[PDB]
Amino acid sequence: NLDIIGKRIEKIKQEHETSWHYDQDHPYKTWAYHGSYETASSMVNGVVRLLTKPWDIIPMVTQMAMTEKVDTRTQEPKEGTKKLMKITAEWLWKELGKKKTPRMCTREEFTRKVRSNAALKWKSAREAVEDSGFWELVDKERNLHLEGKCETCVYNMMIWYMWLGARFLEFEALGFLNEDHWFSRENSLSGVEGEGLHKLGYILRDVSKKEGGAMYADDTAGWDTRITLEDLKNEEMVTNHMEGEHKKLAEAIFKLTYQNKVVRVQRPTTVMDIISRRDQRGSGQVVTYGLNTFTNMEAQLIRQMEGEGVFKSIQHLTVTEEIAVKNWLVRVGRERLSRMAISGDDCVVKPLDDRFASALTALNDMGKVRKDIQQWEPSRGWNDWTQVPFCSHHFHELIMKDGRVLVVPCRNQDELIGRARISQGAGWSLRETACLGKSYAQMWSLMYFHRRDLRLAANAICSAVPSHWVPTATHEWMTTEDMLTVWNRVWIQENPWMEDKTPVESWEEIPYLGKREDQWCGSLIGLTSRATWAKNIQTAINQVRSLIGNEEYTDYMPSMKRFRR
Numbered sequence: 001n002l003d004i005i006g007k008r009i010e011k012i013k014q015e016h017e018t019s020w021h022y023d024q025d026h027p028y029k030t031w032a033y034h035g036s037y038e039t040a041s042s043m044v045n046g047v048v049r050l051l052t053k054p055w056d057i058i059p060m061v062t063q064m065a066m067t068e069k070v071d072t073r074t075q076e077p078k079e080g081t082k083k084l085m086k087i088t089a090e091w092l093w094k095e096l097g098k099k100k101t102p103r104m105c106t107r108e109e110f111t112r113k114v115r116s117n118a119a120l121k122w123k124s125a126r127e128a129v130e131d132s133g134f135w136e137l138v139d140k141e142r143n144l145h146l147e148g149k150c151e152t153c154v155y156n157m158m159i160w161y162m163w164l165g166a167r168f169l170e171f172e173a174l175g176f177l178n179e180d181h182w183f184s185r186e187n188s189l190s191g192v193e194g195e196g197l198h199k200l201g202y203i204l205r206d207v208s209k210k211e212g213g214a215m216y217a218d219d220t221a222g223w224d225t226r227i228t229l230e231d232l233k234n235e236e237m238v239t240n241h242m243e244g245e246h247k248k249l250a251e252a253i254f255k256l257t258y259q260n261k262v263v264r265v266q267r268p269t270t271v272m273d274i275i276s277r278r279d280q281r282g283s284g285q286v287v288t289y290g291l292n293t294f295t296n297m298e299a300q301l302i303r304q305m306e307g308e309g310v311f312k313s314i315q316h317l318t319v320t321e322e323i324a325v326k327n328w329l330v331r332v333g334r335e336r337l338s339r340m341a342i343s344g345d346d347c348v349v350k351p352l353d354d355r356f357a358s359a360l361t362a363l364n365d366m367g368k369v370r371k372d373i374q375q376w377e378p379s380r381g382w383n384d385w386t387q388v389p390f391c392s393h394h395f396h397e398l399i400m401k402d403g404r405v406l407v408v409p410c411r412n413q414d415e416l417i418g419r420a421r422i423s424q425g426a427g428w429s430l431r432e433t434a435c436l437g438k439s440y441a442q443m444w445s446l447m448y449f450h451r452r453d454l455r456l457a458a459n460a461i462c463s464a465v466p467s468h469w470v471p472t473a474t475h476e477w478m479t480t481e482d483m484l485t486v487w488n489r490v491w492i493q494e495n496p497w498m499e500d501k502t503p504v505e506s507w508e509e510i511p512y513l514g515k516r517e518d519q520w521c522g523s524l525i526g527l528t529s530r531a532t533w534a535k536n537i538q539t540a541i542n543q544v545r546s547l548i549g550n551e552e553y554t555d556y557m558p559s560m561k562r563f564r565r
């Protein structure tokens with residue numbers, strides 16, 4: 001406890017010895033308060049907004065740009081629950097480990113990443129990776145970790161940001177999980193890491209093909225707040241697959257940063273608090289993703305065990321029930337993993353039958369309480385894979401004019417248009433604002449080509465931004481290559497669900513949803529505002545061209561039937 005956290009605490013106290021105070025009015029029950037010391041608006045993208053004028057009067061779009069879970073306690077599962085989790089976790093790390101070799105990620109790898117802008121004494125991250133002084137601090141902390149002690153690895157809430165060095169040491173020990181695709185669908189069977197939105201629909205349709213009951217897609221209420229110390233201890237068992245230095249380094253991340261955290265929080269009453277808790281999820285967002293997937297795969301196999309009646313009670317597991325769990329895992333575990341699509345805290349399960357809907361004792365006792373349903377009310381499943389929610393999407397079946405079948409991602413259009421108009425920072429330039437619009441426009445042309453309004457707005461944005469100006473899972477839209485060529489590569493050539501590889505010659509071969517389906521999913525097709533916008537699009541394109549100035553532009557609008565003379 002204070003032995004593992006104090007040094008970190010003691011060091012902060014000294015940096016602010018002229019402003020240290022144990023406020024007796026601390027607003028914390030579950031977090032441990034140690035002391036206190038003295039101490040992000042969403043901006044509108046104008047290129048995108050000028051080219052989506054109809055949406056200026058839709059509150060669901062315009063409101064998106066305007067403007068008690070952490071402080072809670074989770075009860076320790078029953079002994080029978082803890083046994084189910086340990087046995088399942090042990091077996092799950094072995095399966096993930098069968099065709100993967102743990103390893104340490106390198107200064108070299110970490111450096112390169114910071115130079116390509118991935119979200120993770122010196123101004124930026126880039127400058128710190130060059131200064132050998134930094135690495136000397138990394139070395140100091142690094143050798144502290146090998147002795148089982150920590151000094152500078154402290155979480156700052158705002159999301160859990162850390163100093164680049166603690167990020168490096170986290171990445172050094174556990175980066176392999178992401179960098180080497182442990183949660184790929186090949187190596188994990190339930191995972192979808194590296195798959196892409198253009199593959200998730202096909203993956204859900206494949207789960208649909210299995211004999212079984214309804215498809216279940218229960219969200220957890222505040223997943224990262226419901227991670228128990230028993231969960232963090234089952235995650236740590238990845239170190240059993242490790243050796244030498246790596247093993248020691250990983251053990252220290254788990255022991256000193258995950259299973260015993262130190263955090264600094266801003267409280268307007270503006271002081272900085274220094275609270276400590278052993279539970280809940282607090283890692284980098286990328287290690288969080290992988291350990292979430294891991295623990296969710298474990299929770300969902302156990303819920304599947306409960307509905308198949310492998311065990312009778314969570315209160316206590318008989319000796320023979322343990323043998324039966326172990327034998328279920330060996331006999332059918334891989335088959336049961338294949339019945340699920342899991343992305344962090346998000347899941348879809350097609351169980352053997354609908355007893356799963358009412359198998360709630362283990363799930364609730366593990367603390368993974370379902371969102372927006374009474375603790376003991378049975379799950380409502382989906383009968384059609386095209387109605388199931390997953391990663392903020394649903395998936396349509398869309399037949400091309402030549403019989404070939406696309407499975408395409410979709411969500412409420414007002415959400416898509418709302419996101420494209422929003423970013424962060426007051427520092428950016430017009431060329432950079434224009435670059436993001438193209439990044440959104442190119443994503444829309446690759447993922448949402450089947451929505452009439454987004455294909456039109458994507459064509460307008462690409463016509464309004466200089467042709468050679470580059471745009472900012474997989475991200476095939478981040479390129480200067482012609483979008484019709486990328487579409488053919490992603491939806492035809494590299495698509496394992498498409499047998500006939502005949503390239504599409506033009507955008508007009510590429511179909512839309514039915515007009516009524518497009519309206520159901522939020523299209524303004526049929527409105528008077530939308531007809532005026534489409535008819536007069538060249539004038540909106542010219543408004544943006546005049547603002548950016550005398551640059552080299554392309555007209556992409558004749559790629560659509562209605563503008564092609």
Ligand SMILES: Cn1ccnc1-c1noc(C2CCC2)n1
Binds near residue numbers: 046
């Ligand atoms: C390039 N980039 C990455 C993240 N955000 C941006 C960005 N660029 O321009 C803008 C302005 C604020 C609204 C439009 N944001």
Ligand SMILES: [Zn+2]
Binds near residue numbers: 141145149151153256
């Ligand atoms: Zn440390």
Ligand SMILES: [Zn+2]
Binds near residue numbers: 394396410411521
């Ligand atoms: Zn839809």
